């Protein structure tokens, strides 16, 4: 039949490739493309999702990075409106960890890993560099809590715990109170999971508390090594990056291919119900939608532009690859890579914070102790 796979993507030029991407799949029973740009207004965005469905009856929706710098709330109008009918939506260029809950985002699959999955990189990096005492600087937001939640789970797998899990309110200008507590802690390994704005406040304070000197390690994700945060990050920031996270065309082609394989799976089934014609009175939940979403996780791509494209149980990417930057001479130079199972460091050396060539231990002993005694007559 005329299976519609139309997307909702900004970057009008990229949508040209989407038409070619659909045509390429046809050469590989019919797929039609009805790509539409992103509405800047959130309320107008939600209506256009089903309004374009009226003339298309689309089977899945793709959402991408908008021209606006919000980088979040973009898939919310397209996930809930399509989630009412259990229409699967593909997260082309979204990395927020909110979309990883099935209870709220019922039909959503991500072709890129969320920010909260960086802590999988960090935990395996520990054993490579022999680190066990760390300090977490997560934020009070859901994104900060998700990184703390998943990192702690991996730590418990090794019967180890983070020394401190200091949380700070986002948008706080005076963060020195939080970092003041972290100074007396014996762990010299600091893991920061804040946003780009919140990272600048942390970096500014850490500079004036002399926490950026030698013997200190800063493990940091992608948000805090770019934009405003990079302009205040100290040297030796052991950052992280995604190989092709910012490239939309890399993900559209792989995303279209993954749905195409599930389309072949949808060819043979029992009681296949076509998606609703529009948003008029179709209160039905599209019983076939969960079947489409269920087979869409199990559909693993043998190859692709970005390697094998596997979907997690929560819809996230599986076996992704991360690149390890390093702020050497104010320039982020890759000194490692992630193969999806273990860290493969580059041949070149790492310039640690403070200009230390040797790898710092990342731990210290207080020696000076506080001892509490009671008044007892003979002792």
């Amino acid at each position: 039949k005329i299976v519609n796979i139309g997307a909702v993507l900004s970057t009008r030029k990229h949508e040209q490739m989407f038409r070619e991407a659909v045509n390429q799949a046809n050469k590989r029973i019919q797929l039609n493309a009805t790509s539409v740009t992103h509405k800047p207004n959130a309320i107008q965005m939600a209506l256009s999702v089903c309004e374009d469905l009226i003339s298309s009856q689309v089977y899945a929706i793709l959402v991408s990075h908008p021209p606006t710098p919000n980088d979040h709330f973009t898939p919310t109008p397209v996930s809930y409106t399509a989630g009412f009918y259990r229409i699967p939506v593909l997260g082309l260029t979204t990395r927020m960890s909110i979309y990883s809950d099935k209870s709220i985002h019922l039909s959503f699959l991500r072709t890129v890993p969320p920010y909260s999955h960086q802590s999988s990189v960090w935990f395996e990096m520990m054993r490579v560099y022999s680190w066990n005492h760390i300090i977490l600087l997560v934020s009070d937001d859901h994104e900060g809590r998700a990184a703390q939640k998943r990192l702690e789970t991996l730590l418990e797998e090794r019967e180890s715990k983070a020394e401190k899990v200091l949380q700070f309110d986002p948008g706080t200008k005076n963060v020195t109170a939080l970092l003041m507590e972290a100074k007396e802690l014996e762990a010299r390994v600091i893991i920061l999971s804040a946003s780009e704005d919140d990272a600048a406040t942390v970096y500014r304070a850490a500079a004036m508390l002399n926490m950026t000197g030698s013997g200190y390690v800063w493990l940091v994700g992608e948000r805090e090594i770019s934009g405003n945060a990079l302009r205040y990050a100290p040297d030796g920031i052991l950052g992280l990056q995604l190989i092709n996270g910012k490239n939309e065309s890399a993900h559209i082609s792989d995303a279209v291919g993954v749905v195409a394989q599930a389309v072949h799976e949808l060819l043979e089934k029992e009681n296949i119900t076509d998606p609703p014609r529009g948003c008029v009175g179709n209160t039905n939940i599209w019983k076939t939608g969960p079947l489409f979403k269920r087979v869409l996780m199990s559909s693993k791509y043998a190859d692709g532009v970005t390697g094998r494209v596997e979907f997690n149980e929560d819809g996230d990417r599986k076996f992704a690859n991360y690149s390890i930057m390093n702020l050497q001479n104010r320039k982020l130079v890759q000194v490692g890579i992630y193969n999806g199972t273990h860290v493969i460091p580059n041949d070149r050396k790492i310039i640690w914070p403070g200009g230390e060539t040797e790898k710092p231990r990342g731990y210290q002993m207080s020696t000076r102790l506080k001892i509490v005694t009671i008044h007892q007559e003979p002792f």
């Binding site: 000076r368 102790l369 506080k370 001892i371 509490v372 005694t373 009671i374 008044h375």
Partner: protein, 49 residues
């Protein structure tokens, strides 16, 4: 006796100390305290944790 033993511990383990008595004056027990509705230790046991 405890302080004399403490001084020996410091010499044999190479550390310094800051001895301070217990604010509560009690060794330590688990208490209900319905005002906060939480189990916590009081005094010497509550100053370690």
């Amino acid at each position: 006796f405890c302080i004399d033993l403490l001084i020996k511990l410091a010499r044999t383990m190479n550390f310094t100390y800051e001895v301070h008595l217990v604010a509560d004056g009690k060794f330590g027990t688990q208490e209900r305290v319905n005002n906060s509705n939480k189990k916590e230790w009081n005094g010497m046991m509550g100053e370690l944790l």
